[PDB]
UniProtKB/Swiss-Prot annotation:
Protein name: Casein kinase II subunit alpha
GO molecular function, one term: protein serine kinase activity
Included range, full protein: 2 to 331 of 391
Keyword Transferase in annotation: yes
Compartment(s): Nucleus
Amino acid sequence: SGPVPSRARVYTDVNTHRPREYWDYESHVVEWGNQDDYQLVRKLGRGKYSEVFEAINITNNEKVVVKILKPVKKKKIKREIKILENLRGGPNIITLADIVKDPVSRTPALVFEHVNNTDFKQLYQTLTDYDIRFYMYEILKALDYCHSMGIMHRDVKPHNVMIDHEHRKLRLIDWGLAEFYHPGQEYNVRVASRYFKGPELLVDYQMYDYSLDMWSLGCMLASMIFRKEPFFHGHDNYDQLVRIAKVLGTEDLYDYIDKYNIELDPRFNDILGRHSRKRWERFVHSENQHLVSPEALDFLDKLLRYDHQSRLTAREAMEHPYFYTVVKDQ
Ligand SMILES: O=C(O)c1cc2c(ccc3ccc4oc(C(=O)O)cc4c32)o1
């Protein structure tokens, strides 16, 4: 017996009650649209697994985004497609409009609703206190939805939260790393993006859950209210934990690993050190003070916990006083 097991505290058993087909994405049969409906306009980016384009649907003259897939593990294709279909129409979830075969790649191309996004680096510099609260609530709607549907996003970060600021519209995108939560399942820790990786990933604890997304959201919040993007700025995955420990303290880190009977990579022996837990006020200064309130700090504090079991759930987060000032729809 190595690690102590763990379970999500909410939506724990949602998938087990489902028909197999809901989560057994390996058996999913892709429904294909017509590639000729779409004309590529310009490349937006390239990752290790895909290329993303702005495009036009020539049938309706509507802008769309086309992601042409190329993953090495090809079962990930069906996983992303099944998750997108399962979640389609949920609050603030990007809509998959079509799936077509690209004639050049001969691979699936996912067609999504367009978002006229403001670049996050520019945008975060302009967010007011009210805006941060507003958009955080919007992200929480999306996360509580997918969690309630038995799905963890696993790549929450600024790029994946597409905001059209002009129209105050938000969409959670790129479900390519998302997975179905099953109690007792051990998951790959090589997920999320460095600055947003939860302590569970960084200590190699595999039996994690929806609460991973809440750590990532906390990292986003900290970057927004303190105007420090990213907040925990590691050079690699090991330094990433050290950066966290310099804020949350090493004593609570050891309490966490001790709770789950986890051992740190011996790598940490001569780099981790001994750090006190810092008060959040440490990160406040004249340039970010207009974004900080006791409610902001308390909310942040309750997201950024080493113990994934201790973090606020998305629904609990929506109950927080931080959101009292936000006008709800509609
Ligand atoms: O990778 C995906 O799945 C993905 C990317 C996007 C998406 C859905 C809508 C989008 C809308 C605007 C964008 O601007 C960029 C940009 O990079 O500037 C990317 C995107 C994406 O899905």
